[PDB]
Amino acid sequence: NLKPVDAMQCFDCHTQIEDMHTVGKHATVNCVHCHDATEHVETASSRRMGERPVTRMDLEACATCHTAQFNSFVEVRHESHPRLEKATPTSRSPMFDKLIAGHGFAFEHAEPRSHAFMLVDHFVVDRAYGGRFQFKNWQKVTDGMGAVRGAWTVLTDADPESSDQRRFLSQTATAANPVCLNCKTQDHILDWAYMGDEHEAAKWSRTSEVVEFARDLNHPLNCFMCHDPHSAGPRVVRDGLINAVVDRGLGTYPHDPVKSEQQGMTKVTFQRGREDFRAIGLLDTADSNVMCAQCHVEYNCNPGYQLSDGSRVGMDDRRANHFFWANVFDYKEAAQEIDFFDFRHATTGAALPKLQHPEAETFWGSVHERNGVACADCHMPKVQLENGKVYTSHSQRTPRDMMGQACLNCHAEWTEDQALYAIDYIKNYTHGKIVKSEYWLAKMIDLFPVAKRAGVSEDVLNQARELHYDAHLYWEWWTAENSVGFHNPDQARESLMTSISKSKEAVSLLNDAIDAQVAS
Amino acid sequence: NLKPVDAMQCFDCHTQIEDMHTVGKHATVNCVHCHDATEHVETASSRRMGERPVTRMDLEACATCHTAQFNSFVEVRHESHPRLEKATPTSRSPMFDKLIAGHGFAFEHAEPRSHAFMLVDHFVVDRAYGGRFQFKNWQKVTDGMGAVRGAWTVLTDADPESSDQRRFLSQTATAANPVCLNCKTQDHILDWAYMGDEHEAAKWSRTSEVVEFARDLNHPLNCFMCHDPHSAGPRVVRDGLINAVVDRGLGTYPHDPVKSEQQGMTKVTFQRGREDFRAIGLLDTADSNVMCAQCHVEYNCNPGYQLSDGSRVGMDDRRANHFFWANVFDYKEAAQEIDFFDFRHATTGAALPKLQHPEAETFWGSVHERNGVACADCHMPKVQLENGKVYTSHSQRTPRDMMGQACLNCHAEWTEDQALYAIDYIKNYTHGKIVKSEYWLAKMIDLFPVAKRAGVSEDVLNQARELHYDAHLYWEWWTAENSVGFHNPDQARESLMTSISKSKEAVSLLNDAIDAQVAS
Amino acid sequence: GVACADCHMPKVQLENGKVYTSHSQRTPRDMMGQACLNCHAEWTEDQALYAIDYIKNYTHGKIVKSEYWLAKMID
Amino acid sequence: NLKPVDAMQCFDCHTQIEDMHTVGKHATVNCVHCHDATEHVETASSRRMGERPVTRMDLEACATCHTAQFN
Ligand code: HEC
Ligand code: HEC
Ligand code: HEC
Ligand code: HEC
Ligand code: HEC
Ligand code: HEC
Ligand code: HEC
Ligand code: HEC
Ligand code: HEC
Ligand code: HEC
Ligand code: HEC
Ligand code: HEC
Ligand code: HEC
Ligand code: HEC
Ligand SMILES: O=S([O-])[O-]
Ligand SMILES: O=S([O-])[O-]
Ligand SMILES: O=S([O-])[O-]
Ligand SMILES: O=S([O-])[O-]
Ligand SMILES: [Ca+2]
Ligand SMILES: [Ca+2]
Ligand SMILES: [Ca+2]
Ligand SMILES: [Ca+2]
């Protein structure tokens, strides 16, 4: 059985913790629930750590007193189809392979599934670690609780004796790097300096061997990613988000200085050897929009190239850990701001961006966001009980599974069927425009080899390549974003119509140039 | 009412039957249930048949005493979508038409449905008989019991006065030949010599007019295909399977000599005029893996061409009735072994194999097969009754309809939803790789006209054609096979990654050659 | 060695989660999988219910007859 | 928000509770979750209760850490 430790002894050296812990709703929660610090206490001095204390990062550390939230969180939604490839005629992006050719996502890009699996799915996806990590067997794919208990309880490593990124299966890629993991786990929270910069106190950084880093990590989406374990107050821990909101002064709601002020973030820094080491962002309110934006954003977490001169931007560069914190119509300017693109298209040669799940940036300025609605209202609402103590559901999933609490409490005029119909109207319309955008992108892409082989000039090809950047951006935002337009239907419609406009312009340009070469 | 005949009188000339019948569980079942032999008995001699006895081939001959198994067998699974074309974006092979161009399956290749319909579906499919045979009207498509009663009770013939294979509808083919029927019916069991070789006692052979043959056949999947009617013991009757297992000494489990010995087959031959005529294979055990492998295999049942010199291999050749009895990674060697390919691709000119439903060969070496599981355990399990005499379900269908008996009795740790999720994980992953394999195959195929028109050398084109053979094989195995990877997920993944590797190699080869011709 | 809680407040079974003991003390009819069938693998839910009812029906018949005779005496 | 009390101070006069509390699975659960003893501690001796401390009997005293069982 746990025996409490004297927190006062701790507080004598840990004033920041004292100020948070003594004031919040965890004032009675003893340090022993999460820390084993006996040898630490025997050896530390005022400013030197001595022996390192053990810190529990497992979610069961919270489950002891918060079983309801834990159980809600680890639930697996079986209806969320597993390992479902997006590049298929029945999924999100029927022409993805042609459009993304040259990027690592061509190796595999599946639809998301339940949060319990985020770390194991990151480890096993074909694009990440060359097939190095796999489930112990095909049965383990169901085991949400097991994944939560630890990735390495359900996965194998093809070669424990090497630590280099390489392909163990022919059609895999090795795109994973240490920045990825910040959106899968925060087990490394005490071993990673702010932004993944080099730091004497950091075991891991942007430049680490990711296979070695991976083996040190176990748990998905730790409860403390949104809740400070000392104060129990709302927070974020994701460095890239703090950097955008605070360091770059953009605010929690970049479009709304008033809301940004009312619902802001305070950056709190922790030091090692009296030098800044790590940071968190304490929230003024329990604002899920900002909590979820730790991960559900467009980001850089990868090497790339400069737009200016095409030179390599490596993991060592700060730009390899970057939140653009920009909506689709501000994105091109945001990418120019850091002089960055992701890949060159394998067929057209165009410099292109790679877009990822920008739910937070898409939601901005939507009717629901402007009305003060937040992710949790639709995706993790309060539980309604005929008799019971209310708690917040932690099963982050589609509102279709809980329409009464997600939608109909606000929309009293509608039945469930009518609310579903309204969602489907938007999704169906948006998907049709996504498909049409892909059709026009593919038509343009297919003209590039014809143009080059007909002797069309580099000047015309480069014009078309500039059009490709825009056509790609205004399309891929929407295959990347998970709501199929629902989060901001007017924006999706304007963006996708712009993509088609750009592709059509490029098609006409190339067809005309080709025809002129044929006429001599 | 039936009157019993004196079996002892029969046994005086039929010693083989006596040895089987007197010993097995049909020792009390009188010959009159299946044979009308009055005139036969009056005219036969020790070694000459005299007047031919009537032998019932209808399944209702067994239904009289085995109603439960019969009723189970004739059940129609309405949820198994009928006449569903595989070459569509929502089915198995979205790019099938491009990839299979040059083969008869381009005319129609539907998903399989319930066993009751196998013979009528064979007769009516657009690729088989030039549209000659059709259901009497569109209502008959539902009539499983009617099809079982006899194909000609539900079908019409566009021209009873001719017997040549020809097109009655413009977009049909005439691919059917007498070998096909061996996997649809065994009504011809006494009229077909082993392998379909020419034989004085055989009415029908590989070289017969298939339209004439068709008119003589009525019943699907006769009960006696798996059960000897005389001994009631387990057997196979399919010549091609006996040939692979016994004549070629490959064994029932070619990968496992021990299991092959424990679960083997004994070839029993029946003679006409003291010359070998037909054969069956008696099984040591009631092994559904081998019973189902009578049909659910990759086979040759068609003319083709030699790999060596491209010369025609006709129905007269033994190779027109061939079970390769080889897994995907042994197939190319198996096809080289008999010097055979199926068709030349209409666009690329490559010699290609045609793969068909290799469930048996795919299942070999899988985790379930190695653990002693067999087709019937998942597809035709014992019925569970609160009160009753247990019998084996004969409704061969997906385990999704009976998960408790097919999966969960073995997998106690899982709910139905978890077991379904595990299946879908594998199927979703495999389908994504199938789609990607098709993308790369199509990309390569489309480069062939460009290459030929740019004046790329025959040497380079032939290199690409050799790559096409392998890319095609390692893809088509999996659109042909019905489990979408479930029967052997690691093998599907390795094979499909190989297909993509081959296509990518060919694409690079052709693109480079084209570009060199453009640069002069 | 069976106790009240085994039938009236059994452990919750979850596909994924931390097990806890149900504190809803109620008839096992509402949770037959966990209250009965985990021990009685030979039975379906309907068979287990049928066995309960056989006993309850029989006992209640004897209760009613006992009351009939008591009332006859009292009168 | 609840502020923890010095349980060791309590234990100087409550050895019977000490022997139970320090050993079981509530060793880390502070007295303030169920007792309001500020005035008691101001006035008690080991042989004189002084002001009577308040003890919570409501089930929500447990529901705070054991919501699943309470619900
Ligand atoms: C779980 C409910 C915890 C309780 C109770 C206590 N701590 Fe904690 N602590 C916990 C986590 C998950 C972390 C990682 C960092 C994060 O912000 O999540 C920490 C970290 C610390 C640190 C390091 C801060 C730094 O300099 O980087 C200290 C000094 C610390 N914790 C002290 C501490 C004390 C004294 C506690 C008893 C009053 C205590 N913690 C309780 C989780 C939990
Ligand atoms: C028992 C020893 C606990 C441990 C372990 C954890 N928490 Fe806790 N938590 C506990 C109590 C008694 C309370 C106060 C309840 C009340 O409403 O009075 C809390 C509260 C929280 C809250 C709400 C905070 C707020 O609204 O300001 C959160 C978000 C919370 N606790 C989170 C949390 C996390 C993430 C834990 C693991 C690191 C964790 N708790 C452990 C008791 C206990
Ligand atoms: C936070 C800014 C993230 C970064 C850094 C990485 N990922 Fe991610 N990932 C994130 C979210 C919010 C989601 C779900 C939404 C969605 O559109 O998928 C994911 C999903 C994945 C998945 C599962 C789906 C799939 O594409 O197969 C995988 C396998 C995955 N992510 C891998 C991955 C890699 C390799 C990363 C570094 C290059 C990486 N992620 C970073 C959020 C974030
Ligand atoms: C960000 C993605 C979160 C993660 C990770 C965790 N929780 Fe959470 N929690 C989150 C929100 C948006 C809320 C509601 C806040 C509001 O006031 O609207 C909560 C709330 C809690 C509470 C308070 C009681 C309740 O409302 O249920 C607790 C005790 C709590 N959360 C616990 C908890 C646990 C145990 C987690 C790991 C399994 C966890 N949270 C993660 C957002 C997020
Ligand atoms: C209600 C007004 C919502 C708000 C607030 C948020 N989301 Fe949403 N989301 C909503 C709908 C109707 C849908 C489509 C779901 C469906 O079943 O059709 C979605 C979708 C998502 C998804 C994908 C879920 C899935 O398909 O299984 C994600 C990952 C998602 N939304 C994230 C998300 C974020 C991060 C939010 C705050 C920035 C957010 N949602 C708010 C409705 C609503
Ligand atoms: C149905 C339950 C039957 C019973 C009863 C009997 N026979 Fe049979 N017989 C039956 C079938 C379907 C066939 C076709 C071949 C096959 O293996 O399925 C036969 C065949 C024969 C033959 C021919 C063997 C040969 O030389 O090719 C003979 C000589 C024969 N049957 C004899 C026979 C006798 C004597 C029976 C009474 C003891 C008898 N059969 C019963 C189906 C059934
Ligand atoms: C009644 C006159 C029958 C006819 C017609 C058919 N079968 Fe039969 N079968 C019959 C009996 C009395 C038995 C023995 C039952 C027992 O378990 O004691 C059988 C048995 C079988 C079996 C099981 C054999 C074994 O396990 O070794 C099979 C597979 C079987 N019968 C098949 C079968 C077939 C295919 C029939 C049509 C050709 C057929 N039976 C007719 C009685 C009668
Ligand atoms: C009476 C008002 C009818 C209605 C309502 C439906 N059906 Fe019908 N159908 C009817 C007749 C008299 C016939 C012809 C019978 C014959 O054998 O000549 C039919 C035919 C069909 C067919 C066959 C079509 C073909 O081209 O051969 C089909 C597939 C069919 N009917 C189906 C059908 C369906 C699905 C209906 C509900 C939408 C339906 N029918 C209504 C009479 C009437
Ligand atoms: C045994 C080795 C067979 C040979 C010889 C033939 N077929 Fe076949 N067929 C077989 C199986 C096991 C299945 C179901 C599994 C599947 O993948 O389809 C089929 C299916 C058909 C169908 C229905 C599905 C379809 O493709 O439309 C038809 C119409 C069909 N088979 C026709 C057919 C022809 C024309 C054949 C000779 C060229 C032939 N079959 C031979 C097994 C076997
Ligand atoms: C191969 C594809 C089969 C066909 C054709 C028929 N049956 Fe069958 N039968 C098959 C199997 C795999 C089994 C189970 C054997 C085992 O011991 O596991 C059976 C069993 C029977 C029996 C025995 C009693 C029982 O288990 O139900 C009988 C009487 C029987 N089968 C009858 C039967 C009938 C009437 C058929 C035509 C409608 C028929 N079988 C075809 C495999 C196959
Ligand atoms: C359990 C371990 C199985 C074994 C043994 C066999 N099959 Fe199977 N099969 C299995 C699954 C989970 C599926 C997918 C079904 C679904 O609904 O997703 C299949 C599929 C098939 C099919 C197609 C069925 C359909 O889609 O309707 C066929 C024709 C098939 N399997 C044949 C087959 C053969 C011949 C087997 C022995 C060699 C065999 N299966 C074994 C599970 C299992
Ligand atoms: C007994 C006759 C079984 C049947 C019926 C089903 N399964 Fe099975 N399965 C069985 C065993 C003994 C094992 C191996 C256990 C181990 O850990 O070694 C399996 C394995 C699986 C797997 C993993 C496959 C892999 O390649 O790793 C899966 C996904 C699986 N089983 C699923 C499954 C399904 C969906 C079934 C119903 C169609 C099913 N099994 C039936 C034993 C038996
Ligand atoms: C007697 C009628 C009880 C009442 C009053 C309460 N609980 Fe209980 N509890 C009881 C039993 C029989 C058990 C299972 C013991 C075993 O090991 O089999 C429990 C268990 C708990 C636990 C431990 C964790 C768990 O198994 O769920 C807790 C934390 C718990 N009970 C809490 C609790 C609460 C909050 C109560 C008031 C709402 C409560 N118990 C009352 C029996 C009885
Ligand atoms: C948070 C500050 C708590 C309060 C308030 C209550 N309990 Fe508790 N309980 C808490 C913890 C951290 C634990 C240990 C969890 C573990 O297993 O590590 C417990 C445990 C129990 C148990 C199980 C004890 C056992 O020996 O198995 C029970 C039955 C229990 N708690 C009951 C209980 C009651 C009745 C409460 C109101 C008087 C109560 N707890 C409050 C944390 C907290
Ligand atoms: O404690 S030391 O820093 O004097
Ligand atoms: O690759 S992750 O960003 O989905
Ligand atoms: O019966 S005859 O062969 O002599
Ligand atoms: O054509 S048959 O083999 O499916
Ligand atoms: Ca999903
Ligand atoms: Ca990006
Ligand atoms: Ca089917
Ligand atoms: Ca073939």
PDB file of N, CA, C and O in Angstrom, chain B residues 246-259:
ATOM      1  N   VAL B 246      -2.281 -37.026 -55.205  1.00  0.00           N
ATOM      2  CA  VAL B 246      -1.896 -38.435 -55.288  1.00  0.00           C
ATOM      3  C   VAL B 246      -0.962 -38.699 -56.476  1.00  0.00           C
ATOM      4  O   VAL B 246       0.175 -39.105 -56.266  1.00  0.00           O
ATOM      5  N   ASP B 247      -1.409 -38.438 -57.702  1.00  0.00           N
ATOM      6  CA  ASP B 247      -0.598 -38.812 -58.884  1.00  0.00           C
ATOM      7  C   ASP B 247       0.767 -38.119 -58.855  1.00  0.00           C
ATOM      8  O   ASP B 247       1.802 -38.718 -59.203  1.00  0.00           O
ATOM      9  N   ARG B 248       0.755 -36.844 -58.447  1.00  0.00           N
ATOM     10  CA  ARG B 248       1.955 -36.020 -58.416  1.00  0.00           C
ATOM     11  C   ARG B 248       2.635 -36.069 -57.044  1.00  0.00           C
ATOM     12  O   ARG B 248       3.649 -35.400 -56.815  1.00  0.00           O
ATOM     13  N   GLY B 249       2.086 -36.883 -56.142  1.00  0.00           N
ATOM     14  CA  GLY B 249       2.678 -37.137 -54.825  1.00  0.00           C
ATOM     15  C   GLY B 249       2.892 -35.912 -53.951  1.00  0.00           C
ATOM     16  O   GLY B 249       3.718 -35.932 -53.042  1.00  0.00           O
ATOM     17  N   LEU B 250       2.146 -34.839 -54.207  1.00  0.00           N
ATOM     18  CA  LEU B 250       2.368 -33.586 -53.463  1.00  0.00           C
ATOM     19  C   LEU B 250       1.800 -33.619 -52.044  1.00  0.00           C
ATOM     20  O   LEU B 250       2.261 -32.882 -51.170  1.00  0.00           O
ATOM     21  N   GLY B 251       0.825 -34.491 -51.812  1.00  0.00           N
ATOM     22  CA  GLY B 251       0.226 -34.629 -50.480  1.00  0.00           C
ATOM     23  C   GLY B 251      -0.914 -33.634 -50.263  1.00  0.00           C
ATOM     24  O   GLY B 251      -1.055 -32.657 -51.003  1.00  0.00           O
ATOM     25  N   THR B 252      -1.736 -33.898 -49.251  1.00  0.00           N
ATOM     26  CA  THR B 252      -2.868 -33.025 -48.926  1.00  0.00           C
ATOM     27  C   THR B 252      -2.390 -31.674 -48.353  1.00  0.00           C
ATOM     28  O   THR B 252      -3.059 -30.650 -48.507  1.00  0.00           O
ATOM     29  N   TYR B 253      -1.235 -31.702 -47.690  1.00  0.00           N
ATOM     30  CA  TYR B 253      -0.596 -30.519 -47.122  1.00  0.00           C
ATOM     31  C   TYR B 253       0.846 -30.502 -47.627  1.00  0.00           C
ATOM     32  O   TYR B 253       1.745 -31.019 -46.964  1.00  0.00           O
ATOM     33  N   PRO B 254       1.070 -29.913 -48.813  1.00  0.00           N
ATOM     34  CA  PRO B 254       2.382 -30.035 -49.470  1.00  0.00           C
ATOM     35  C   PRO B 254       3.527 -29.479 -48.641  1.00  0.00           C
ATOM     36  O   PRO B 254       4.676 -29.877 -48.840  1.00  0.00           O
ATOM     37  N   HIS B 255       3.201 -28.576 -47.717  1.00  0.00           N
ATOM     38  CA  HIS B 255       4.177 -27.958 -46.837  1.00  0.00           C
ATOM     39  C   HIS B 255       4.431 -28.782 -45.567  1.00  0.00           C
ATOM     40  O   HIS B 255       5.292 -28.432 -44.770  1.00  0.00           O
ATOM     41  N   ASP B 256       3.675 -29.860 -45.366  1.00  0.00           N
ATOM     42  CA  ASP B 256       3.707 -30.568 -44.086  1.00  0.00           C
ATOM     43  C   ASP B 256       3.541 -32.069 -44.322  1.00  0.00           C
ATOM     44  O   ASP B 256       2.409 -32.578 -44.357  1.00  0.00           O
ATOM     45  N   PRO B 257       4.669 -32.786 -44.514  1.00  0.00           N
ATOM     46  CA  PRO B 257       4.611 -34.234 -44.779  1.00  0.00           C
ATOM     47  C   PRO B 257       3.947 -35.040 -43.659  1.00  0.00           C
ATOM     48  O   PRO B 257       3.312 -36.059 -43.932  1.00  0.00           O
ATOM     49  N   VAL B 258       4.070 -34.584 -42.419  1.00  0.00           N
ATOM     50  CA  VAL B 258       3.461 -35.288 -41.297  1.00  0.00           C
ATOM     51  C   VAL B 258       1.927 -35.187 -41.339  1.00  0.00           C
ATOM     52  O   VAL B 258       1.220 -36.208 -41.284  1.00  0.00           O
ATOM     53  N   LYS B 259       1.422 -33.956 -41.456  1.00  0.00           N
ATOM     54  CA  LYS B 259      -0.017 -33.718 -41.575  1.00  0.00           C
ATOM     55  C   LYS B 259      -0.569 -34.395 -42.834  1.00  0.00           C
ATOM     56  O   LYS B 259      -1.661 -34.965 -42.810  1.00  0.00           O
TER      57      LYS B 259
END
